[PDB]
Design an enzyme around this catalytic site. Structure first.
Site, mmCIF file in Angstrom:
data_model
loop_
_atom_site.group_PDB
_atom_site.id
_atom_site.type_symbol
_atom_site.label_atom_id
_atom_site.label_comp_id
_atom_site.label_asym_id
_atom_site.label_seq_id
_atom_site.Cartn_x
_atom_site.Cartn_y
_atom_site.Cartn_z
ATOM 1 N N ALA A 197 0.924 -1.496 0.056
ATOM 2 C CA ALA A 197 0.477 -0.276 -0.375
ATOM 3 C C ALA A 197 1.063 1.097 0.268
ATOM 4 O O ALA A 197 1.869 1.214 0.763
ATOM 5 C CB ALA A 197 -0.889 0.243 0.696
ATOM 6 N N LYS A 208 -5.329 5.669 0.939
ATOM 7 C CA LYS A 208 -4.459 4.291 1.041
ATOM 8 C C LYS A 208 -5.254 3.672 -0.999
ATOM 9 O O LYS A 208 -6.288 3.797 -1.370
ATOM 10 C CB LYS A 208 -4.643 3.180 1.564
ATOM 11 N N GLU A 261 -9.118 9.354 7.255
ATOM 12 C CA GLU A 261 -8.603 10.711 8.306
ATOM 13 C C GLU A 261 -7.322 10.385 8.222
ATOM 14 O O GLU A 261 -6.433 10.101 8.027
ATOM 15 C CB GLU A 261 -9.048 10.355 9.677
ATOM 16 N N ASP A 297 -2.246 -5.949 16.354
ATOM 17 C CA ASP A 297 -1.685 -5.625 15.735
ATOM 18 C C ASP A 297 -1.116 -4.057 16.168
ATOM 19 O O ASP A 297 -1.352 -3.244 15.057
ATOM 20 C CB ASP A 297 -1.655 -5.973 13.672
HETATM 21 C C1 LIG Z 1 0.370 15.005 6.420
HETATM 22 O O1 LIG Z 1 0.860 13.597 7.866
HETATM 23 C C2 LIG Z 1 1.189 12.862 7.126
HETATM 24 C C3 LIG Z 1 2.561 13.068 6.751
HETATM 25 C C4 LIG Z 1 3.630 12.197 6.496
HETATM 26 C C5 LIG Z 1 5.311 12.474 6.345
HETATM 27 O O2 LIG Z 1 5.522 13.165 6.389
HETATM 28 N N1 LIG Z 1 5.977 11.065 5.962
HETATM 29 C C6 LIG Z 1 7.492 11.571 5.690
HETATM 30 C C7 LIG Z 1 7.342 12.045 3.755
HETATM 31 C C8 LIG Z 1 8.668 11.993 2.995
HETATM 32 N N2 LIG Z 1 9.163 10.875 3.338
HETATM 33 C C9 LIG Z 1 10.730 10.369 2.477
HETATM 34 C C10 LIG Z 1 9.332 10.002 4.722
HETATM 35 C C11 LIG Z 1 7.760 10.114 4.857
HETATM 36 C C12 LIG Z 1 3.529 11.100 6.758
HETATM 37 C C13 LIG Z 1 1.573 10.782 6.219
HETATM 38 C C14 LIG Z 1 1.167 11.495 6.769
HETATM 39 N N3 LIG Z 1 -0.028 11.494 7.708
HETATM 40 C C15 LIG Z 1 -0.556 10.084 7.483
HETATM 41 C C16 LIG Z 1 -0.766 8.902 7.473
HETATM 42 C C17 LIG Z 1 -1.417 7.547 6.814
HETATM 43 C C18 LIG Z 1 -2.313 8.294 7.681
HETATM 44 C C19 LIG Z 1 -3.322 9.607 8.159
HETATM 45 N N4 LIG Z 1 -2.316 10.214 7.757
HETATM 46 C C20 LIG Z 1 -3.337 6.917 7.696
HETATM 47 C C21 LIG Z 1 -5.278 6.902 8.066
HETATM 48 N N5 LIG Z 1 -2.136 5.654 7.147
HETATM 49 N N6 LIG Z 1 -0.977 6.820 7.056
HETATM 50 C C22 LIG Z 1 0.122 5.569 6.768
HETATM 51 C C23 LIG Z 1 -0.357 4.917 5.934
HETATM 52 C C24 LIG Z 1 0.800 3.982 5.695
HETATM 53 CL CL1 LIG Z 1 0.218 2.694 3.824
HETATM 54 C C25 LIG Z 1 1.674 4.147 5.543
HETATM 55 C C26 LIG Z 1 2.186 4.856 6.668
HETATM 56 C C27 LIG Z 1 2.837 5.859 6.938
HETATM 57 C C28 LIG Z 1 4.364 6.151 7.137
HETATM 58 C C29 LIG Z 1 6.111 6.663 6.536
HETATM 59 N N7 LIG Z 1 6.370 6.828 6.080
HETATM 60 O O3 LIG Z 1 5.560 8.111 8.197
HETATM 61 C C30 LIG Z 1 1.453 5.890 7.039
#
Ligand SMILES: COc1cc(C(=O)NC2CCN(C)CC2)ccc1Nc1cc2c(cn1)c(C)nn2-c1cc(Cl)cc(CCC(N)=O)c1
Length: 261
Positions: free
Chosen positions: A28, A45, A94, A139
């Site tokens: 995903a 997603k 959300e 989980d």
């Molecule tokens: C707007 O807020 C967010 C910001 C970011 C973010 O800044 N990620 C950085 C982007 C740059 N790369 C290099 C690293 C992660 C990531 C997610 C956000 N919000 C955000 C993420 C969300 C959700 C809500 N809201 C839900 C619900 N499920 N998920 C969800 C779903 C998956 Cl499949 C994977 C991740 C993962 C991990 C990660 N890399 O942080 C999260």
């Protein structure tokens, strides 16, 4: 194969603009998606049918959706409709703009006691909702405890959740979380994956001498060998740990990087 810049569905007939990439999660991928009419923002997603060509895996996601759809609580990730086209399956959720309690842990290590009280409380309350509605999460982890601009914990990710081992596995995950929060390292974490499984089986851990007795008490019972001797969800909030020291009602966004003063 290209994921469409706009996302529409035969059902609700709303248009979603594919915005910034947020991260991966197995097969995903998540994108900030905006409703093109209301301008309301959601976490989308996107799963390809190429990863869902099998009838077996296709059940896992339709089980997860069925469970998430039925949920509505201020501590669970809001479900907001799913759909599909020929190529990809879409799930609208959300938006939690402050990533997860994992990122917080990695950046903070051991949080202060009043912080963990707060994070635990909000988390446990959502686990109560789940448990009241015959749902076991199965989980629960820091990566699953999502944080929003108000530092509110919102439980997501039901990929391994079921509806009616029983409820007391979720109580165990929570023990781990509370441990990892207060101590700064996971209680069974090791470099070798197989070693981790052994540690769990033999119940091999020790809460360091430095941790508050009342805190280490609640941890041990939440981690107890005998699942039937673990406290029930309702029995957690009432515990001395939540009712002894200071328990703040709101946390600043600063807690993401530095301890609160
Ligand atoms: C707007 O807020 C967010 C910001 C970011 C973010 O800044 N990620 C950085 C982007 C740059 N790369 C290099 C690293 C992660 C990531 C997610 C956000 N919000 C955000 C993420 C969300 C959700 C809500 N809201 C839900 C619900 N499920 N998920 C969800 C779903 C998956 Cl499949 C994977 C991740 C993962 C991990 C990660 N890399 O942080 C999260």
């Amino acid at each position: 194969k290209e994921i469409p810049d706009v996302l529409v569905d035969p059902r609700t007939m709303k248009r979603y603009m594919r915005g910034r990439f947020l991260g991966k999660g197995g097969f995903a991928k998540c994108y900030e998606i905006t409703d093109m009419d209301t301008k309301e923002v959601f976490a989308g997603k996107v799963v390809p049918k190429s990863m869902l060509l099998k009838p077996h895996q296709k059940e896992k996601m339709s089980t997860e959706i069925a469970i998430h759809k039925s949920l509505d609580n201020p501590h669970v990730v809001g479900f907001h409709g799913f759909f599909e086209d020929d190529d990809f399956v879409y799930v609208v959720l959300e938006i939690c703009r402050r990533r997860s309690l994992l990122e917080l842990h990695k950046r903070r290590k051991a949080v202060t006691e009043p912080e963990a009280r707060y994070f635990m409380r909000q988390t446990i309350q959502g686990v109560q909702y789940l448990h009241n509605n015959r749902v076991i999460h199965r989980d629960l982890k820091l990566g699953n405890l999502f944080l929003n601009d108000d530092m509110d914990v919102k439980i997501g990710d039901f990929g391994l959740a079921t509806k009616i081992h029983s409820f007391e596995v979720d109580i165990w995950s929570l023990g781990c979380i509370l441990y990892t929060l207060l101590v700064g390292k996971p209680p069974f974490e090791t470099s070798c994956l197989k070693e981790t499984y052994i540690r769990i089986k033999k119940n091999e851990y020790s809460v360091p001498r430095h941790i508050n007795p009342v805190a280490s008490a609640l941890i041990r019972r939440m981690l107890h060998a005998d699942p039937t001797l673990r406290p029930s969800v309702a029995e957690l909030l009432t515990d001395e740990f939540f009712t002894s020291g200071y328990a703040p009602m709101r946390l600043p966004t600063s807690c993401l990087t530095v301890p609160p003063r």
